[PDB]
Amino acid sequence: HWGYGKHNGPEHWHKDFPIAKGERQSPVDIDTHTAKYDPSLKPLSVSYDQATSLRILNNGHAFNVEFDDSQDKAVLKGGPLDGTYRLIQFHFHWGSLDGQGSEHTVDKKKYAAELHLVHWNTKYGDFGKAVQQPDGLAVLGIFLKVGSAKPGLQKVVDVLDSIKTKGKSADFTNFDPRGLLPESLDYWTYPGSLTTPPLLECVTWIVLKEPISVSSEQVLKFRKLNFNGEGEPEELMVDNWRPAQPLKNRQIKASFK
Ligand SMILES: OC[C@H]1O[C@@H](O)[C@H](O)[C@@H](O)[C@@H]1O
Ligand SMILES: OC[C@H]1O[C@@H](O)[C@H](O)[C@@H](O)[C@@H]1O
Numbered sequence: 001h002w003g004y005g006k007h008n009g010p011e012h013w014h015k016d017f018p019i020a021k022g023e024r025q026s027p028v029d030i031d032t033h034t035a036k037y038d039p040s041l042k043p044l045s046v047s048y049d050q051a052t053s054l055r056i057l058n059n060g061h062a063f064n065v066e067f068d069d070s071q072d073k074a075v076l077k078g079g080p081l082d083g084t085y086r087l088i089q090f091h092f093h094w095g096s097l098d099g100q101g102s103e104h105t106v107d108k109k110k111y112a113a114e115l116h117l118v119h120w121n122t123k124y125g126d127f128g129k130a131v132q133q134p135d136g137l138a139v140l141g142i143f144l145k146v147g148s149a150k151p152g153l154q155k156v157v158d159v160l161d162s163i164k165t166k167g168k169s170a171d172f173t174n175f176d177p178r179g180l181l182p183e184s185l186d187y188w189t190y191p192g193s194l195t196t197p198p199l200l201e202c203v204t205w206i207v208l209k210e211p212i213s214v215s216s217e218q219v220l221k222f223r224k225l226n227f228n229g230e231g232e233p234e235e236l237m238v239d240n241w242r243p244a245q246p247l248k249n250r251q252i253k254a255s256f257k
């Protein structure tokens with residue numbers, strides 16, 4: 001029943017998900033001047049060469065590209081992380097206009113969209129158990145700005161017409177998520193939460209400093225998706241982002257000096 005409209009959006013979520021007002025909610029504004037270099041961070045390792053994508057799903061909130069997470073095929077390690085985190089899915093948040101869409105902000109600046117690559121800590125066996133743990137998840141967040149096209153995004157763009165409405169899915173095998181990364185892995189990190197209900201406080205956030213560029217045409221196709229199901233009145237899937245939440249008793253650490 002939650003969503004992004006005036007009547008069911010982020011300002012309403014706390015009534016069914018009281019952790020929405022919790023001590024480690026996401027997203028947050030990243031104040032780049034206050035973030036501190038952390039020499040204790042180990043090198044970050046994004047190891048996606050054996051990733052196995054399976055399917056793309058319109059879940060009524062965003063679209064998820066799902067991966068085979070039945071073994072360590074595509075993993076995130078290092079940086080702030082203790083152990084191995086397995087890629088389960090990625091999705092985006094985006095705006096109705098290029099001037100908004102990201103969840104995290106950088107010195108209050110909003111990007112056109114934000115990519116979330118979602119991983120779970122293998123020590124907990126399954127995603128469901130991982131979301132009962134303070135260190136259960138790691139989300140790699142990547143900002144999107146509008147400029148030149150991102151070649152590695154085009155396959156995603158081109159399948160969206162087949163999953164226009166809530167509940168539709170399509171095969172999405174042999175997709176390489178490495179094509180969605182920027183050149184640099186410089187990042188900020190902090191402890192937070194899922195940014196959608198159930199808002200669980202299980203996430204180590206790793207937000208890359210360098211945005212990727214996508215073309216206007218690519219993001220315009222995101223904005224043709226529908227929140228509604230087939231045959232229902234059309235509600236464009238736009239502005240599916242939660243605003244920044246209070247930082248509370250947290251510090252953002254930087255991987256770079
Ligand atoms: O097909 C997408 C990707 O799938 C992975 O399993 C392969 O190891 C990569 O070489 C390939 O780019
Ligand atoms: O007490 C000093 C310590 O304060 C903490 O809040 C900072 O995260 C550390 O980087 C610093 O060394």
Ligand SMILES: OC[C@H]1O[C@H](O)[C@H](O)[C@@H](O)[C@@H]1O
Binds near residue numbers: 155159171173175
């Ligand atoms: O890699 C993701 C998808 O890209 C394109 O849609 C290909 O036609 C399809 O075979 C593949 O599953």
Ligand SMILES: Cc1ccc(S(N)(=O)=O)cc1
Binds near residue numbers: 002009012015016
């Ligand atoms: C009608 C309705 C409105 C909002 C929600 S919430 N608290 O899940 O956002 C649920 C039902």
Ligand SMILES: Cc1ccc(S(N)(=O)=O)cc1
Binds near residue numbers: 139194196
């Ligand atoms: C189930 C779930 C997974 C990941 C997220 S996010 N937007 O915090 O990456 C939210 C919900």
Ligand SMILES: [Zn+2]
Binds near residue numbers: 195
């Ligand atoms: Zn997300």
